[PDB]
Amino acid sequence: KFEDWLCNKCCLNNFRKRLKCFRCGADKFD
């Protein structure tokens, strides 16, 4: 994990700096 997270809806990875999943739009914290 090089400073990133995975969405809890589409399972897509995203930068730690990000705020919400750019694919489904939903936040990593729902």
Ligand SMILES: [Zn+2]
């Ligand atoms: Zn997502």
